[PDB]
Paper text:
The respective glycosyltransferases are important virulence factors such as the Clostridioides difficile toxins A and B. Here, we describe two glycosyltransferases of Yersinia species that have a high sequence identity: YeGT from the zoonotic pathogen Yersinia enterocolitica and YkGT from the murine pathogen Yersinia kristensenii. We show that both modify Rho family proteins by attachment of GlcNAc at tyrosine residues (Tyr-34 in RhoA). sYeGT has a cone-shaped structure comprised of a globular domain with a Rossmann-like fold on top of a three-helix bundle. The catalytically active domain is the Rossmann-like fold domain, which features a 6-stranded antiparallel β-sheet flanked by 7 α-helices.
Interestingly, in the absence of ligands, sYeGT crystals belonging to space group P43212 appeared rapidly and diffracted X-rays up to 2.3-Å resolution while in the presence of UDP-GlcNAc, P21 crystals were visible only after 8 weeks but diffracted better, with a resolution up to 1.12 Å. The asymmetric unit of the ligand bound sYeGT crystal comprises two molecules. Each protomer includes the complete N-terminal part of the construct but lacks 14 residues at the C-terminal end. Although sYeGT was crystallized in the presence of the substrate UDP-GlcNAc and Mn+2, only the UDP moiety was visible in the electron density map suggesting that the sugar nucleotide had been hydrolyzed during the crystallization process. The uracil moiety is mainly stabilized by residues from the WIG-motif (residues 44–46). In detail, Trp-44 forms a stacking interaction with the purine base, and backbone atoms of Ile-45 and Lys-48 form hydrogen bonds with the polar side of the base. The ribose moiety is stabilized by hydrogen bonds to main chain atoms from residues Ile-43 and Ile-151 and to the gamma-oxygen from Ser-133. Notably, a third aspartate residue, Asp-153, is indirectly involved in the manganese coordination via a water molecule. Another notable feature is the loop flanking the nucleotide binding site (loop F, residues 171–188), which is bent toward the nucleotide when the latter is present.
Residue numbers in the entry: 15 to 257, 268 to 300
Write the structure that this text describes.
């Protein structure tokens, strides 16, 4: 055994996944016939104003009854801002997006006027085809994102146990992603299965619990328990090197680095889940 070798494989682990740059697009969704709220207009203007280096868009859908009046209302409220409104059906890639099995279910869900539920599918499809940052219309921009880059090209906020929930879930807003990101693709694959199975449980469709399952499948160490087992494997390697044998704070920080970095949207957006 060699402590020189050990220090080197700890250094290697820290740097295993180079940070991948995120496209400077902020995607938000306001689909359906309802007038966007005064609060969500203010939060949207604030999102765009804090991010002058980003193109901020609100996506609507001309395939939904009553879309025109809702689109017109938004056009008037955002006329002074750099926010642009875009029809999902106008996207250059819509011909391919329309053929996605998940888009079949998006169409079924918007027909039943479940727009929040439909947004869980649509946010993933937009990230798949464009990359950038998806944010809920009702999420608070704390400060500008600036130039972001994430290990495995995926950025999320910290997990927590949601209201009346059992297990910790990563929120599915905001999400930063490289185009065609494996985590986004896995979430869509799990969602298509849940919908094909005729799932009625709203926690088992395309929401935070499904996003969390996708993140754990693609990046196992995102689970605090699995990272624990990885740290224990390095502790064993340190014992082998020295055969004082416990991992230092610095060693644990190095081994955990990319998993902490993936939670890097935590400081930029507040979803109000932590409000009194
Ligand atoms: O009529 C509606 C209702 C919701 N949404 C979108 O769906 C997102 C998710 O819904 P919501 O924020 O209500 O979900 P939660 O914050 O409870 O997860 C919203 O932020 C909007 O971006 C929409 O486009 N039209
Ligand atoms: Mn929300
Ligand atoms: Na499932
Ligand atoms: Na190891």
């Amino acid at each position: 055994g060699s402590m020189q070798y050990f220090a080197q494989i700890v250094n290697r682990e820290e740097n295993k996944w180079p940070s991948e740059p995120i496209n400077k697009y902020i995607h938000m969704i306001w689909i359906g016939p309802k007038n966007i709220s005064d609060k969500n207009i203010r939060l949207s203007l604030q999102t765009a104003q804090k991010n002058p280096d980003y193109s901020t868009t609100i996506i609507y859908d001309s395939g939904i009854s009553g879309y025109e009046a809702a689109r017109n209302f938004m056009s008037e409220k955002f006329k002074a801002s750099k926010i642009t409104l875009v029809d999902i059906r106008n996207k250059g890639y819509f011909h391919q997006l329309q053929q996605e099995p998940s888009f079949t279910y998006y169409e079924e869900v918007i027909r039943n006027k479940k727009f929040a539920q439909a947004s869980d599918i649509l946010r993933l499809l937009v990230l798949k085809y464009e990359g950038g940052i998806y944010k809920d219309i009702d999420d608070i921009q704390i400060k500008g994102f600036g130039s972001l880059a994430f290990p495995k090209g995926i950025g999320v906020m910290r997990e927590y146990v949601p209201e009346a929930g059992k297990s910790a879930a990563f929120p599915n807003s905001p999400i930063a992603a490289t185009k065609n990101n494996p985590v986004v693709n896995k979430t869509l694959e799990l969602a298509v299965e849940n919908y094909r199975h005729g799932e009625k449980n709203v926690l088992k469709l395309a929401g935070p619990d499904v996003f969390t399952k996708a993140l754990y499948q693609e990046i196992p160490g995102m689970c605090s328990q699995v990272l624990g087992t990885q740290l224990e494997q390095f502790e064993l390697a340190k014992r082998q090197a020295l055969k004082d044998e416990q991992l230092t704070l610095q060693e644990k920080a190095k081994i955990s680095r990319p998993y902490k970095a993936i939670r890097g949207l935590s400081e930029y957006v507040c979803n109000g889940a932590d409000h009194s």
